[model samples]
Target chain A: TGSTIAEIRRLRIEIEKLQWLHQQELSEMKHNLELTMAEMRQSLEQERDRLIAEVKKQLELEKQQAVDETKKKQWCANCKKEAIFYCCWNTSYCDYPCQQAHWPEHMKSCTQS
Target chain B: STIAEIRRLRIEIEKLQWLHQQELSEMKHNLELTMAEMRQSLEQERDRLIAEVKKQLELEKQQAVDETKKKQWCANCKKEAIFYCCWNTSYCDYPCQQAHWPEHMKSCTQS
Candidate 1:
């Protein structure tokens, strides 16, 4: 036996809450992502500001103030082999010697900061 | 039928929450991994540049610790906070200077 507690409001309320929660969940996820990146940015935001400014000064709008990691996904772009370093960058070669070997030529008015 | 429907709704809600919990877990795991990577890069940048740093970074340094809520002390937090700002430096864009502060700081007209 079922009793009526106003089917309209019951069904209506549930749907509204579900939609509201779906939006809430997505927003929270996005916030967490942004916050995580923000933390990374904040970690070096001060000390790295000068370097970033310098890099930005040299790079184009699409270019960046930091590592261009996706340039090589899993291997060295030059040797095209399993990397001692992968996804290295125009960055001052984070911690690698090959970066020095790879980027030997200082192009006229072109050197990554 | 409403009884069955109501039960179904409960199941749906449970499923969605469970699904979201998984998603959040993946997110937490991804960011934590990325943070460790950042620590590796930053630690080296730090070692060569200056001898000290930290204001707050919870991405755990020492792998050896009692299995508890312990986190690696971020090298940037301490050195920067003391040398960076009055409260929390390098973040001019967040609520650190607002609602988290006392009411007057929030209400203050000062920049």
Candidate 2:
């Protein structure tokens, strides 16, 4: 009877030791998994920020291009003239001597007539 | 050996329970964050659409105002023999009088 009780006690001690070792391993695994997931989240955030910045930059460039084109077309109402010093939409007649005779009646009548 | 195996399985169950709790908390937080982001994006889109609609309406209103200004004319030109009043661009000459020139100047000749 004494030998049997001693054997049972020794087996119980071995079981407790094995359980402790297993718990420690599981804890370490959980810690490693958490670290990996955190790194993944950080990388995803960086990628999203980069994409947003690229899109904003493209939009700004397009807007600036549109403004430049509008400014170029704003100076002259008539598309035939290439002169930079020509009259704009606000003026009725062209300032140049060659095109002065072809001024519209609205501009000429509003000023001279 | 059997007793040791049972102990190891119980420890594994405890570890899994802890992981399950963490996973549930993470899921709840992720859901909340996703809902917040969805609301923010929806609000931004709504504001953009409202601004776009307002801009379009303002443009249409300005065009209507310009058309109204362009149609203004002298009313006295229709009462007498003066048929040289300005005509609307949309339609041919009607009997509509001009609304701008004075009454005494209606008889004045352009030539």
Candidate 3:
């Protein structure tokens, strides 16, 4: 009878000890998971912030280039080069050959008036 | 009395074991879900930023092409000039040359 009681007590103690150990392991894993999540979030935030700053910088650069764009000279519509001659209504050409080549399309919209 | 206490302790141990298993399973499921969601969010955000950056890059490239063309094109009348008069001065024909000559003669260095 005494032996039965002692064995029961020993079993209870062992089970409790194992529960504590398992809980410790779970707690440690949870801590590690939190740290992992924090690091991933930090990295993502840093990258996102860096990209946002870069995009803003690019926008500012593009905005500052407005004057440059306005000051930019036009190119030939057909040959895609610097245009020396202008026809009616924004059509331009590097020379007569380009103009002649482009007239087939331009004939539909010609208006010297 | 001893037998009764032994039976009581056995039941208590079983309950504790069951509770521990439940806690373990719940924690595992939640952790897995949270990790997956975080990864998905990061992926979507990164993809969006990358697309925006790519478009910006395209705009910058077009702007650079325009600037390069400006360097190679004419200083006046936007014409491609084979006749270079002086440093950074060029004209496509005599009409443009004569048209610009009155102002250009003050700084003309070409012989």
Candidate 4:
């Protein structure tokens, strides 16, 4: 009977040890998962920012090109003569004088037109 | 007296078994919960990554389109013509189909 008692005590000790090991492993796994999640979130944010910047850059370039084309067309209308000058300037003074001379007319008649 | 001790041992064994079962169930529940949470987080991360990549790809496509459009040359008659002048007697006559002549003439006038 004494030996049986000892065996039962040994079994309980073993069960406790197993439970402790299980909990420790689970805790480690949870910690690792949390770290992985943090890294993933950081990477995703970086990628998102990069994409947003790139999209903004593309949109700006498109808008600039549209403005350039509009300016070229407006210059052509005022010059009345087919004289090709590179109107690569981003400001008002970049156009030929004939076009500049008609700026008032353009301001008056141009309807976003 | 020996029989009483044996009965106590039996009770002790029953109690330990019950405790072991409870602990095992708790461990199982904890593991399941952890695994479920991990899976959910991973799926969410995957979706976010895909969205980010897709947005990047769209921006790249727009950039390519803009570049193509920018390369398009506008058709104008002045771009194809050249100006020439013939000096006869004390006068010169300039003939050209170019449009930007007036701006150049303005500069000459300034000089």
Candidate 5:
């Protein structure tokens, strides 16, 4: 009876140890799974955000190009006609006569432009 | 009593083996379900962003076309022009034409 009790105790202790080891393995796997998912989620989010930023930047660049092209076409400040001579920011002229005629009145704005 | 105790311990070991297998399988299934759900969520987000980009591009294209199609303004009073005197000169009426002719004549090359 003594030997039988000893055998039963040893078996129970062995099973308990295995259960503890299995629990540890399961805990480690669960933690690793959560960590992997978090990494993947963050990585995908970063890629998505990068693509969105690129798209927005591309649109802004195109819009800026269009604005620059529009600015390139200078108009006469005095007659509101298309200008050939770009004198300054506030003054463009279709002819020399218009530039000479408008110089006195435009001197203040011209100094500023 | 001793024999019964041994039998109970044997049964206990069997139960532990079954429990470990069941729990491992359950965790694997849970992980698979979680991964699948995240994939679906990410895909939906990607599709929504794609739709927004498409709409934004169309809106910008329409705005550009509208800006390009705008009518020319009169050189004198800055109103909608009707009469063309030159390539860059236009007048809303005869009075605006007469009023602007002094400045227009300096650059006018028309016959």
Candidate 6:
């Protein structure tokens, strides 16, 4: 019985150790995402809002528009791409040049664009 | 010796208990450290977002203020009574005296 008690304690120690490690993994993942978001904000600076506006438009558009075959992300409204500037008002531009080129029509509906 | 084997088990059994206690203490400290770091990281992120937003709002606010402040020339006086104290009052500069303002309501013809 004494030996059995020791064995039980040993098993418990292993279990707790594994659980702690698992929690560590979750913390790392959350940390990674947080860092990425902050980094993106810092890099974009003033243009950060432009990215948000595009995303907003994307949500509204896909609300009505049928799903694309690619099944990844919606293409840019201006110059379509998975990696595009997501506007708060739901406008999309692949890059600054696309935003510049397609500024006219996009701004018609989205004044902020 | 068989007796030596028994004695060895006795020593190792105590060693196991000691190992378990040590690990518990060590792991708890380590876990708490990581948790603290993770918390700090999140706190840093929150501050960074707020910092960006602070600059953003200030920039926009300053821009609108500057634009509006420029074109606030009173039509009646044309002396730029940008500081409108009230709908009935206006001031081109500061202080009670030496201040150019509309003497009468809606009329600032130097009196």
Question: Which candidate number maximizes DockQ?
Answer: 3
Please give, for residues B22-95, the per-residue lDDT of candidate 4 as tens digits. 99689778866885686578668756875776677667655544443322222232222122211100111133
Query: What are the lDDT scores of the predictions, listed in order?
Result: 0.45, 0.48, 0.71, 0.51, 0.72, 0.53
Q: Give the better candidate number (2 or 5) by DockQ.
A: 5
* Weakest ten-residue segment in model 5 chain A by summed lDDT: A65-74
What value does the TM-score of chain B take for model 1?
0.38
What would the per-residue lDDT of candidate 6 be over residues A1-113, giving only the tens digit for each residue?
A: 56656655665676577579768766786777677656654655445456556545655454323322222233456644543564433355667888777777767767443
Which of 1 and 6 is the better model by lDDT?
6
Residue pairs that clash (backbone atoms under 3 angstroms), model 5: none
TM-score of each: 0.33, 0.32, 0.47, 0.35, 0.47, 0.33
Q: How closely does chain A match the true chain A in each prediction, as TM-score?
A: 0.28, 0.48, 0.50, 0.49, 0.43, 0.33
Candidate 3 has an interface RMSD (Å) of: 8.2
Clashing pairs in 4: A82-B99, A83-B99
Complex DockQ per candidate? 0.02, 0.03, 0.11, 0.07, 0.10, 0.02
The 10-residue segment with the lowest total lDDT in model 5 chain B: B64-73
lDDT of 1 at B34: 84
> Taking the tens digit of each residue's C-alpha lDDT, what string does model 5 give over A1-113?
78887787778788788889888987898788778878988888788888788877887777656643433344666665567875653356878888888888878677433
Q: Which ten residues in a row have the lowest lDDT in candidate 1 chain A?
A: A64-73
Compose the digit string of candidate 2's lDDT tens values, residues B1-111. 666665566677668767966986797689668756865775577558656655665565544433323222224332212244322111113433333344424553443
Which portions of model 1 show Cα errors greater than 4 Å?
Answer: A1-9, A28-36, A45-113, B45-111
Tens-digit lDDT string for candidate 6 (B45-91):
75677667556655655454333332333324444444544322444
Please tell me how candidate 2 rates in CAPRI terms. incorrect
Assign candidate 1 its CAPRI class.
incorrect
- Please write out the lDDT profile of model 4 over residues A1-113, one tens digit for every residue: 77767766766776677688768877897788678657866776686567657766776676555544442331244433333543322112225685577567656644432
Better model by lDDT, 5 or 6? Answer: 5
User: Alpha-carbon error at B96 in model 4, in Å?
Assistant: 13
